[PDB]
Amino acid sequence: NLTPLFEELLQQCPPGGQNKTAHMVSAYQLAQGNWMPTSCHVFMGTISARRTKTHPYEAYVKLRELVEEHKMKTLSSLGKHNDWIIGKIKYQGNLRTKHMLNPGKVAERHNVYNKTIGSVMTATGIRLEKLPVVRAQTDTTNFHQAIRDKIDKEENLQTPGLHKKLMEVFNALKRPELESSYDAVEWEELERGINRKGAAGFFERKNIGEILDSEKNKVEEIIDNLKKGRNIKYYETAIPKNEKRDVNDDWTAGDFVDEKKPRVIQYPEAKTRLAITKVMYKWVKQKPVVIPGYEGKTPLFQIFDKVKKEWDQFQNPVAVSFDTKAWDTQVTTKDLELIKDIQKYYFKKKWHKFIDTLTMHMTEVPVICADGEVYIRKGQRGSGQPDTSAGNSMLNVLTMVYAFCEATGVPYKSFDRVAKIHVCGDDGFLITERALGEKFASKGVQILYAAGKPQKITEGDKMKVAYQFDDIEFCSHTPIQVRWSDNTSSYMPGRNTTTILAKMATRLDTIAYEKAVAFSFLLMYSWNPLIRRICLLVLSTELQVKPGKSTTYYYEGDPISAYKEVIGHNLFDLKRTSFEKLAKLNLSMSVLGAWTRHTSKRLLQDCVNMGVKEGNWLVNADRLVSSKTGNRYIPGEGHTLQ
């Protein structure tokens, strides 16, 4: 017989659940005969069978090949940790990627017009038909090509020994007063500013709020294992821009943040977003600001006021822009390893394992598409990661300081003595003397390729150089200057009049909201009289209704006093808007034909026709309206919130 040799292998065949779905044969009736396996796993002494007339040796012959087959799949590809995603596959994958993995698939918001604000515009002659559309979506056929055109690529060639020279740079701007101090935050500070409707991962069913409401302990798990050193089932989810699941966990300082978003948004599970944030809150939100020149916490109206205070100190100043062609897909793995080392400098000793583990996942990122198509990302930064704004910024300044010093020979220590730098994620610029700025302008497009951050096509391979202050571009705005009553000057954030009217009149699937929008726009665009007069005309409607709260800002009490609180001047005090700069930004209106010759005066007459009746009328907040209407506006106490 052969059973004494069959008991040998049985005490080696892997365990399994005793399944009665078929025939579970004996540890000895195998050597009987005609009982050959079709599966291996033992139920404390059984396997499958087939009644296939096998010889007492043909049984052992087959079974030992399954044990060889099991000791093989168990004990490559798809990462050294991400191997779990193979289970969730069911179909073969059509994505046609040439530079990264693609193992199959898994089982798988219209924008509307503002009633009040839009009606106001049409009444003056503004043709909304001739205005840019600012919320278009995209087809999935177009979406699939977007991944092949932008995302699937081998990590760019970062020059030998570069990430040492980048640490050489960070060593200068390090903050020893904060070294090894950061810690996890309590659930209250994290929850304070959080969007209760944050998007959920592909395998998730509840959103950021419900995760907080019910399974707050499940997030505490992800935090523990990561802090202990265990691999977690890290996945990211990929959706196109303006998809119903493109939702920000934090507050955007303007409608421009969602605008400098890439076509392809990658975000981890909502439970994972909170796990990272309840820990790294001090870095990701950048609660103390550490990356020099990071303006993500700065509000829009002072962004250029703060800068002109530095531009006015250089004997002959110039500015240079960072146009990194699609920055998010330009991040090598040594980069994530660098930001990892940075995060360890300011975080406590207990939390390094959290940083060590999480970074390992962020290098080999498995990303599930909207239709189920799963791909493996060759590094790069997911645009929806918690570390995006924080990490990208630190990466921008370290690269751009390197590129500046490398093109000009200025030591890394002596950088602040010859230049100032401002960034926001990947967008930013850099101010210095005319002499130095030209070197970094020409040699820059080269040195930046060497680092792996390729500039755009540009002109003659020279970076964008701003010679006069008001030619700077930052956060999709440009500096425009206003002159107040008391003859002072101050720069406000400027933009194209069409691009503002487009973003102001549209929604995304409510008079209170219409007013909070008009106030939020007045803080930034009171320099544009066509827009100031619109905002006053909407705010002066239905003064009973308190304003909304879902937009960037809103007001508590009297808006003309809230404006005073944040701008440092009353809207009445706006005496003159810069002559030349207001031409350039109004010009897009005439080329598109969005206004008429009579539009400028017609908007003004409606304000004068409103605030001429005896009393205290909002529209009188305009300097000229009040000027020809005789009255003034006396506002009570008002404040600004978000």
Side-chain angles (χ1 to χ4, degrees), residues 156-157 159-173:
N156 320 300
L157 267 39
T159 307
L162 152 73
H163 295 52
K164 176 59 165 218
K165 299 279 271 169
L166 284 205
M167 200 71 171
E168 209 144 296
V169 164
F170 162 86
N171 195 245
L173 56 89

mmCIF file of all heavy atoms in Angstrom, residues 156-173, unseen atoms left out:
data_model
loop_
_atom_site.group_PDB
_atom_site.id
_atom_site.type_symbol
_atom_site.label_atom_id
_atom_site.label_comp_id
_atom_site.label_asym_id
_atom_site.label_seq_id
_atom_site.Cartn_x
_atom_site.Cartn_y
_atom_site.Cartn_z
ATOM 1 N N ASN A 156 11.213 60.695 -13.899
ATOM 2 C CA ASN A 156 12.179 61.496 -14.636
ATOM 3 C C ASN A 156 13.581 61.301 -14.066
ATOM 4 O O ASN A 156 13.772 60.814 -12.950
ATOM 5 C CB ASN A 156 11.787 62.970 -14.606
ATOM 6 C CG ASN A 156 10.300 63.170 -14.760
ATOM 7 O OD1 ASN A 156 9.709 62.784 -15.768
ATOM 8 N ND2 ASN A 156 9.681 63.763 -13.750
ATOM 9 N N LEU A 157 14.573 61.686 -14.861
ATOM 10 C CA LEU A 157 15.969 61.388 -14.554
ATOM 11 C C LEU A 157 16.524 62.498 -13.670
ATOM 12 O O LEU A 157 17.042 63.506 -14.149
ATOM 13 C CB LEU A 157 16.770 61.227 -15.840
ATOM 14 C CG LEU A 157 16.895 59.798 -16.385
ATOM 15 C CD1 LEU A 157 15.601 59.010 -16.219
ATOM 16 C CD2 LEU A 157 17.345 59.797 -17.842
ATOM 17 N N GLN A 158 16.413 62.309 -12.356
ATOM 18 C CA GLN A 158 17.019 63.230 -11.405
ATOM 19 C C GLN A 158 18.516 62.946 -11.328
ATOM 20 O O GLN A 158 18.927 61.826 -11.001
ATOM 21 C CB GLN A 158 16.357 63.102 -10.034
ATOM 22 N N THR A 159 19.324 63.965 -11.648
ATOM 23 C CA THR A 159 20.781 63.935 -11.741
ATOM 24 C C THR A 159 21.409 63.229 -10.543
ATOM 25 O O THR A 159 20.873 63.299 -9.428
ATOM 26 C CB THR A 159 21.321 65.367 -11.861
ATOM 27 O OG1 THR A 159 20.651 66.037 -12.936
ATOM 28 C CG2 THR A 159 22.818 65.383 -12.142
ATOM 29 N N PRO A 160 22.515 62.505 -10.749
ATOM 30 C CA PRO A 160 23.233 61.880 -9.628
ATOM 31 C C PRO A 160 23.496 62.820 -8.460
ATOM 32 O O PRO A 160 23.832 63.991 -8.666
ATOM 33 C CB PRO A 160 24.551 61.447 -10.278
ATOM 34 C CG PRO A 160 24.186 61.164 -11.708
ATOM 35 C CD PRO A 160 22.941 61.953 -12.046
ATOM 36 N N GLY A 161 23.345 62.316 -7.236
ATOM 37 C CA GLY A 161 23.666 63.090 -6.049
ATOM 38 C C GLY A 161 22.883 64.375 -5.898
ATOM 39 O O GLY A 161 23.338 65.293 -5.207
ATOM 40 N N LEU A 162 21.714 64.470 -6.532
ATOM 41 C CA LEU A 162 20.924 65.693 -6.436
ATOM 42 C C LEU A 162 20.213 65.784 -5.092
ATOM 43 O O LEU A 162 20.230 66.833 -4.440
ATOM 44 C CB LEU A 162 19.913 65.761 -7.581
ATOM 45 C CG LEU A 162 18.616 66.533 -7.321
ATOM 46 C CD1 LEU A 162 18.880 68.026 -7.304
ATOM 47 C CD2 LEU A 162 17.575 66.197 -8.370
ATOM 48 N N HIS A 163 19.591 64.688 -4.656
ATOM 49 C CA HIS A 163 18.822 64.720 -3.421
ATOM 50 C C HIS A 163 19.708 64.816 -2.185
ATOM 51 O O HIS A 163 19.182 64.949 -1.075
ATOM 52 C CB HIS A 163 17.909 63.498 -3.340
ATOM 53 C CG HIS A 163 16.845 63.472 -4.393
ATOM 54 N ND1 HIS A 163 17.121 63.620 -5.736
ATOM 55 C CD2 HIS A 163 15.502 63.343 -4.300
ATOM 56 C CE1 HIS A 163 15.997 63.562 -6.426
ATOM 57 N NE2 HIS A 163 14.999 63.392 -5.578
ATOM 58 N N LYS A 164 21.031 64.741 -2.344
ATOM 59 C CA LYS A 164 21.927 65.193 -1.285
ATOM 60 C C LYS A 164 22.032 66.712 -1.287
ATOM 61 O O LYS A 164 21.950 67.349 -0.231
ATOM 62 C CB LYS A 164 23.308 64.557 -1.443
ATOM 63 C CG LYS A 164 24.329 65.056 -0.428
ATOM 64 C CD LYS A 164 23.880 64.782 0.997
ATOM 65 C CE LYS A 164 25.031 64.941 1.974
ATOM 66 N NZ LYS A 164 24.959 63.921 3.050
ATOM 67 N N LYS A 165 22.205 67.306 -2.474
ATOM 68 C CA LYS A 165 22.280 68.760 -2.588
ATOM 69 C C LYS A 165 20.971 69.420 -2.188
ATOM 70 O O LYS A 165 20.965 70.576 -1.750
ATOM 71 C CB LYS A 165 22.646 69.160 -4.018
ATOM 72 C CG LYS A 165 23.989 68.639 -4.496
ATOM 73 C CD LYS A 165 25.132 69.515 -4.002
ATOM 74 C CE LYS A 165 25.424 70.654 -4.973
ATOM 75 N NZ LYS A 165 26.354 71.667 -4.392
ATOM 76 N N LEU A 166 19.851 68.715 -2.357
ATOM 77 C CA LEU A 166 18.578 69.241 -1.884
ATOM 78 C C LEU A 166 18.518 69.221 -0.363
ATOM 79 O O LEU A 166 18.020 70.168 0.257
ATOM 80 C CB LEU A 166 17.426 68.439 -2.482
ATOM 81 C CG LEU A 166 17.106 68.723 -3.949
ATOM 82 C CD1 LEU A 166 15.657 68.382 -4.239
ATOM 83 C CD2 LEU A 166 17.418 70.165 -4.317
ATOM 84 N N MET A 167 19.021 68.151 0.257
ATOM 85 C CA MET A 167 19.163 68.146 1.709
ATOM 86 C C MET A 167 20.169 69.194 2.157
ATOM 87 O O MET A 167 20.003 69.816 3.213
ATOM 88 C CB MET A 167 19.585 66.764 2.198
ATOM 89 C CG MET A 167 19.302 66.529 3.671
ATOM 90 S SD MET A 167 17.548 66.360 4.059
ATOM 91 C CE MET A 167 17.633 65.849 5.776
ATOM 92 N N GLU A 168 21.230 69.388 1.370
ATOM 93 C CA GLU A 168 22.154 70.493 1.603
ATOM 94 C C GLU A 168 21.408 71.822 1.679
ATOM 95 O O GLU A 168 21.739 72.686 2.501
ATOM 96 C CB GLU A 168 23.203 70.525 0.488
ATOM 97 C CG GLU A 168 24.555 71.096 0.878
ATOM 98 C CD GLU A 168 25.710 70.390 0.181
ATOM 99 O OE1 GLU A 168 25.914 69.183 0.427
ATOM 100 O OE2 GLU A 168 26.423 71.049 -0.608
ATOM 101 N N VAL A 169 20.391 71.998 0.835
ATOM 102 C CA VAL A 169 19.602 73.227 0.862
ATOM 103 C C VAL A 169 18.736 73.270 2.114
ATOM 104 O O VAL A 169 18.774 74.238 2.882
ATOM 105 C CB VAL A 169 18.749 73.355 -0.412
ATOM 106 C CG1 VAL A 169 17.672 74.402 -0.215
ATOM 107 C CG2 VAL A 169 19.621 73.703 -1.608
ATOM 108 N N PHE A 170 17.945 72.215 2.337
ATOM 109 C CA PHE A 170 17.063 72.179 3.501
ATOM 110 C C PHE A 170 17.825 72.356 4.801
ATOM 111 O O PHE A 170 17.280 72.890 5.774
ATOM 112 C CB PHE A 170 16.274 70.870 3.546
ATOM 113 C CG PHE A 170 15.684 70.570 4.899
ATOM 114 C CD1 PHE A 170 14.448 71.080 5.250
ATOM 115 C CD2 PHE A 170 16.345 69.753 5.808
ATOM 116 C CE1 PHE A 170 13.893 70.812 6.484
ATOM 117 C CE2 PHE A 170 15.790 69.480 7.047
ATOM 118 C CZ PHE A 170 14.561 70.007 7.382
ATOM 119 N N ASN A 171 19.079 71.908 4.845
ATOM 120 C CA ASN A 171 19.881 72.087 6.044
ATOM 121 C C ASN A 171 20.031 73.556 6.415
ATOM 122 O O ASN A 171 20.259 73.869 7.590
ATOM 123 C CB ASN A 171 21.253 71.447 5.849
ATOM 124 C CG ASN A 171 21.995 71.275 7.149
ATOM 125 O OD1 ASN A 171 23.037 71.887 7.372
ATOM 126 N ND2 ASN A 171 21.449 70.447 8.030
ATOM 127 N N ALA A 172 19.888 74.462 5.444
ATOM 128 C CA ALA A 172 19.983 75.892 5.717
ATOM 129 C C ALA A 172 18.676 76.454 6.263
ATOM 130 O O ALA A 172 18.693 77.286 7.177
ATOM 131 C CB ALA A 172 20.389 76.644 4.451
ATOM 132 N N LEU A 173 17.535 76.028 5.714
ATOM 133 C CA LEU A 173 16.237 76.536 6.134
ATOM 134 C C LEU A 173 15.560 75.634 7.162
ATOM 135 O O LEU A 173 14.348 75.746 7.377
ATOM 136 C CB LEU A 173 15.324 76.750 4.922
ATOM 137 C CG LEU A 173 15.021 75.617 3.939
ATOM 138 C CD1 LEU A 173 13.804 74.824 4.375
ATOM 139 C CD2 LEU A 173 14.800 76.192 2.554
#
